[model samples]
Target: TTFAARLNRLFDTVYPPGRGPHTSAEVIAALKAEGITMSAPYLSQLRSGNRTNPSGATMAALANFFRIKAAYFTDDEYYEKLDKELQWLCTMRDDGVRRIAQRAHGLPSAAQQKVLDRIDELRRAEGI
Candidate 1:
């Protein structure tokens, strides 16, 4: 995958799935605390794909801060595995999913099936 795509997804999915990307100011402050120098505008360029080849140390630091393996930023297949797992974990962490599933707990079998069927319809309606 392109570094730009990888970085974008990292920002998107690294935290809760749907909240929003972390602010550049927040990331810059985090990096500074780790003794790395990065400007908000510079991160904007990186996130926008205008700056592609960030320094190795900077890239490694970012991976470290995100709690992902360094290979995730550079190795396509490795990232495929990591990203698959990350998405799964995020889904499990999702509050909406938990609430709905918990709400359906111990319902009659038919009722549970209706929920599942309705979800399938909704998924198809959204083309997902």
Candidate 2:
């Protein structure tokens, strides 16, 4: 799907359908509350598909605002693609590998290590 389509979908999901739709102003207000600052024109460009390439920080802000994953904005099929890789990695049975993958993907170190430790504990308990 296009960026406009994804943005529309996210808006629909986040706001009640019967309450009308959110304008760029509303989105900007929400983002501002989260310490993200962007011009209304920029948001309008995104809504109108004039600006399709959003920065990583903008994508992260949108994800946090919508309470969805960042991949939702960047990936056409989102979790469909991620699920395949997750399944493959989970089957590999290696905490070090998982940590490396997480770090390579720019996850926070603390978060990456926590995931690594949790997976290690799960594997140990299951004797995998």
Candidate 3:
């Protein structure tokens, strides 16, 4: 699907068919619990493309509830592409970091420290 056709794709992933018995009402209620309220009309706006952008609170609400992120709603093609890479990174987390750490053991002490420093900076970036 082109991005437009899939505008609600991630949403469908979050609210699948024959499951959760999910309704826009459930969404509104969940949002209401987050001190955010939404009407089915508003959600319909999102689904029907009558509303493309939403407030950060509503955006955050959906992002938090869904396995996707705020990026899922407020992203471009490039950002959407990141989901794949991000998933790869997540999948690689244990083996990747551990292997890199182990390989760092082979480096010279000074070079190992530099690699560690880069890893620290990367950790900061990831946490963002």
Candidate 4:
């Protein structure tokens, strides 16, 4: 299948059948509330599978909507990668590091990166 098809499938599966209907405006507003800037048209393209080869920004917006990493949209192996990363990060002894990672799970891309960097630094310095 093409990337677009795969992406559409992923979105459908992730969002699922029982999920309530969500409009492009609603998705955009939710993402915006999480500090992700996205327009309704962009979300419409994604939901309708009209846009192929989504840009990094679009992918980031999707990730924000799902509270996941942007790479998760493009990479077929994202689940394992994210699972591994989460497992590694969650083992930290420091409450601050763990809290940051937990919070990062719901953060926008930039904020999540900051939390990840801090966690990495602490892990390297203190063997967390």
lDDT of 1 by residue, 1-128 (tens): 67878887887777645676677677788899988888777889888888889888878877877778889988889999999987876696789889887789899999999999999999999999
Question: How are the candidates ranked when ordered by TM-score, highest leading?
Answer: 1, 2, 3, 4
Off by over 4 Å in 3: 1-7, 15-21, 77-128
- lDDT by residue for model 4 (4-99), tens: 554444444444345544445667788778787877676566656676677787777666675677766556587556656545533654587786
Q: lDDT tens string, model 2, 1-128?
A: 67777776666545553475566787789898878798989877887899988899988887787677898777767745644654563454568777656455776777778878888999999999
Residue pairs in candidate 4 whose N, alpha carbon or C atoms collide under 3 angstroms: none
Q: Write model 3 residue lDDT over 1-128, tens digit each, in one string.
A: 33333445554433543554355677778878978777888787876777776778777776676546666656677556855654554454467667766677778888988887888999999994
Higher-lDDT candidate of 1 and 3:
1
Misplaced by over 4 Å in model 1 are 16-20, 93-128
Q: Kindly give the stretch of ten consecutive residues in candidate 2 with the minimal lDDT sum.
A: 83-92
Comparison by TM-score, 1 against 2, better one: 1
**After best superposition, candidate 1 residue 39: deviation in angstroms?**
1.6
TM-score-better candidate, 1 vs 4: 1
lDDT of 3 at 101: 62
Q: Where does model 4 exceed 4 Å of error?
A: 1-7, 15-21, 79-128
Indicate the worst ten consecutive residues by lDDT in candidate 1: 15-24
lDDT for model 2 comes to: 0.73
